[PDB]
Write a protein that binds this ligand. Structure first.
Ligand SMILES: Nc1ncnc2c1ncn2[C@@H]1O[C@H](CO)[C@@H](NC(=O)[C@@H](N)CO)[C@H]1O
Length: 224
């Protein structure tokens, strides 16, 4: 029975757990449509995350700096979704947000040509324009590892084996048949990710160690 207080001081009493999206829809259709994520007691959370206890809630939209960062991060997931369709054997490493954009380091046997990059961007636009929902599932360290092992995603498994505590609960984000892992938040639907472009590619050693494989870094930019 969390008591939710909004920035304006208005309060809402609930006798069941509610998500930022649930509260946004209670306020109005416009706010629900604009909702990308929420901030609960100072912490950024996905719009679908349940609030069980009393809390201060704010709704994050594309007009917020946090909203732009989330859109950029979700565009990295979109790149993965598309590249796994074009070259299924590709292995995804790390895809973070950077100042004015994002990048994703990938392991695939073909050295990407400019035509390949253009094909990748084209597929990304096609997929994003389907306006599919991003489905989030909070899971155990072990379920996350099984999920990526079953996909042959060795770098994701390595991140779990060496960089994530066994008691941590990773967030899995499903984009149709594609799945990625992140602390998030991520957009609730890809309709928020139509404005982006791929830029250049570069090379980067996995974990910055020259004893490891040289990956391909694909750079992109995205905006509201
Ligand atoms: N404790 C944790 N729980 C959930 N996700 C975690 C995590 N520690 C690291 N990550 C994710 O692993 C990738 C490399 O840091 C990062 N994510 C990614 O590279 C893809 N989502 C592409 O954006 C990062 O979010």
């Amino acid at each position: 029975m969390p008591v939710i207080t909004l920035p304006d001081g208005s309060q809402r009493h609930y006798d069941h757990a509610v998500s930022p999206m649930d509260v946004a829809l209670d306020i109005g259709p416009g706010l629900a449509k604009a909702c990308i994520a929420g901030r609960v007691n100072g912490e950024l959370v996905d719009a679908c995350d349940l609030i069980e206890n009393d809390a201060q809630l704010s709704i994050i939209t594309a007009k917020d700096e946090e909203g732009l960062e989330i859109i950029r991060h979700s565009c990295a997931h979109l790149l993965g979704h598309a590249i796994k369709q074009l070259w299924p054997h590709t292995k995804m490493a790390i895809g973070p947000v950077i100042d004015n954009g994002f990048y994703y380091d990938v392991d695939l046997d073909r050295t990407l040509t400019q035509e390949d990059v253009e094909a990748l961007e084209k597929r990304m636009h096609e997929l994003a324009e389907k306006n599919y929902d991003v489905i989030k599932k909070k899971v155990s360290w072990h379920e996350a590892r099984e999920t990526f092992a079953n996909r042959g995603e060795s770098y994701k498994v390595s991140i779990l084996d060496e960089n994530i505590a066994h008691d941590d609960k990773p967030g899995l984000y499903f984009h149709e048949e594609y799945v990625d892992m992140c602390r998030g938040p991520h957009v609730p639907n890809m309709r928020f990710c139509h404005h982006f472009k791929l830029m250049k590619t570069a090379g980067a050693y996995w974990r910055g160690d020259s004893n490891n494989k040289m990956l391909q870094r694909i750079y992109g930019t995205a905006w509201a």
